[PDB]
Design a protein around this ligand. Structure first.
Ligand code: HEM
Ligand code: HEM
Ligand code: HEM
Ligand code: HEM
Lengths: 140, 131, 140, 133
């Protein structure tokens, strides 16, 4: 599913995320909570904005993991199994939430990156879709 | 939200004739199996089914005003119980499957679309106080 | 991830569906159109009920493909690739339609089958979700 | 639908001064690359011309934030009854618009302002979906 041109583009995006995973993460989760408040139901937080300590914490973990998925483009099924088990069996997050978060990550990049062309967006969205798929795979 | 008479009658007569408690109990057990993550929150299935079915009857009693009767139920789900609203239709879709089970050939695509519509109205009502 | 009990139940449901594919498929489609009329957009039909001749024809094709998928539980990616290309690139079906149809096939089974336990329903839904996933795999 | 003044102002000021046709043109173009199956309706052509149509309708919703449903009757019938647009694909357009508003507004596109635009578009999606039967 990954063309040479997408692999390159994902690589470059991964490197920029890696520099500031908590900032990117906290913002994407703040978007989630604002545009889909049902997602707040999983989190016992006082502050659901990007300012929130616990939002920052989860946000970095999200983005660090996306970065790693990016460094695992041809292995994603095996690479993501640990996380699929935690989300799917321990935390029991309803799988409908993964593609909401994906779109919130994409919107965050659009507000930040000098360049977010339709080709680049397509590339990242493909990475996020594969991530959502794996994270949704160990529920039942 | 605008209802046809056929829709009002299908929903009202079913509630007045079928054992919707029994339907609920089975729909809860179904949702737990098909959608295991929904068991997180939960106990007796039949006693909880009674309370759920109470709320639905409340919705049927007031088909034009479901939201306004659902305020407090909605707040409880959002603020105290912290139910993911994205999971509401997994219960209501299980209800449809148990309705299909009961009604068999009478569960026509038309009648099926009636229950779908009723449940969507329910979902919107119980989702309304998530902020 | 199909347990032997799931494999066996799926096998059982597949033989049932195999007996009357047009019957089952035309009903599942009339359900799709009735519950999700946005789905009619793809079909230049005059009759969208299970009595429609073109409903019956697509219906049979759908159900036979499910039956045949039920024989490929271990290699659905390879198996469904042509169908994924056809739906994704030629017919250009918005993928959100696939789970709507799946649920409509589940309801159809529930109105007809001599036994539709939560265990059996889960087994079938997992198959259908696997199918939806493949058919959504070759859009981009 | 009830609206705060910040919601009205955020939408209204944006349509007043932003180059909304250029936004629409890029959003449409984006939606084609990100969601290719959506180009199926346009085989049957300038993205820019089409954006001008959409943007006029958005402006119509803007001018009437409290009665959008009522202004979209004929628009919606056309999409359901003549053009055969899958209504499940409407948000692919509006989500691309949101991506284009993010690109214009940068850090001003806060999660909060983001949610104003999502609310706006869902009212629009509901309005243009209302005549699918
Ligand atoms: C790309 C998607 C996501 C990734 C990569 C991700 C990653 C992670 C990681 C690495 C952890 C710590 C897990 C551990 O300690 O083993 C975690 C915790 C957690 N995740 Fe996610 N996550 C994602 C999406 C989501 C979504 C969409 C939700 C619900 C809407 C969610 C809910 C949670 C919760 C509740 C915790 C526990 C900590 C807390 O309450 O803040 N996750 N996640
Ligand atoms: C959409 C249809 C639903 C209706 C009509 C409904 C209705 C209700 C009502 C009326 C109550 C009691 C409120 C009170 O305590 O005053 C309740 C409690 C509860 N609900 Fe729901 N509910 C629905 C969906 C769900 C779903 C999908 C879940 C979980 C996935 C859920 C989880 C719970 C839990 C954990 C309780 C507390 C039960 C107890 O402590 O015994 N509900 N529900
Ligand atoms: C389980 C899922 C489905 C399966 C297995 C399936 C299978 C098939 C098959 C075998 C054909 C014959 C086309 C060919 O290969 O020559 C076909 C045609 C077609 N399908 Fe599907 N389909 C499924 C779901 C859907 C959905 C959800 C839609 C749209 C809502 C759709 C839209 C179409 C259209 C527009 C055609 C061809 C037009 C025509 O038949 O006249 N399919 N499908
Ligand atoms: C949801 C936001 C949308 C708005 C506000 C909107 C608005 C409009 C309007 C006002 C028209 C002109 C109808 C007339 O008076 O003849 C139109 C036409 C059209 N729309 Fe949409 N539309 C939207 C979404 C879509 C989407 C998602 C598609 C498909 C991807 C689409 C496909 C078309 C086509 C093919 C035409 C006719 C163009 C022509 O042949 O002249 N529209 N739209």
């Amino acid at each position: 599913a990954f063309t040479g041109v997408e692999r390159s583009t994902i690589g470059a995006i991964a490197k920029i995320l890696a520099s500031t995973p908590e900032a990117y993460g906290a913002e994407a989760l703040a978007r989630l909570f604002a545009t889909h408040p049902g997602a707040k139901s999983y989190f016992d937080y006082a502050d659901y904005s990007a300012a929130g300590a616990k939002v920052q914490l989860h946000g970095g973990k999200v983005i660090r993991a996306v970065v790693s998925a990016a460094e695992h483009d041809d292995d994603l099924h095996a690479h993501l199994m640990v996380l699929a088990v935690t989300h799917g069996k321990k935390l029991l997050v309803d799988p409908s939430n993964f593609p909401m978060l994906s779109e919130c990550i994409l919107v965050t990049l659009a507000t930040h990156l000098a360049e977010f062309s339709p080709a680049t967006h397509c590339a990242v969205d493909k990475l996020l879709s594969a991530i959502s798929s794996e994270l949704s795979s160990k529920y039942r | 939200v605008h209802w046809t008479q056929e829709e009002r009658d299908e929903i009202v007569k079913t509630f007045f004739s079928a054992n919707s408690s029994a339907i609920g109990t089975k729909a809860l057990e179904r949702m737990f199996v098909v959608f295991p993550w929904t068991n997180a929150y939960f106990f007796s299935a039949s006693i909880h089914a009674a309370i759920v079915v109470g709320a639905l009857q409340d919705a049927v009693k007031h088909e034009d005003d479901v939201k306004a009767e659902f305020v407090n139920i909605s707040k409880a789900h959002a603020d105290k119980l912290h139910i993911d609203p994205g999971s509401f239709h997994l219960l209501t879709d299980s209800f449809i499957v148990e309705l299909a089970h009961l009604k068999k050939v009478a569960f026509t695509p038309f009648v099926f679309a009636v229950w779908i519509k009723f449940f969507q109205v329910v979902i919107d009502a119980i989702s309304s106080q998530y902020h």
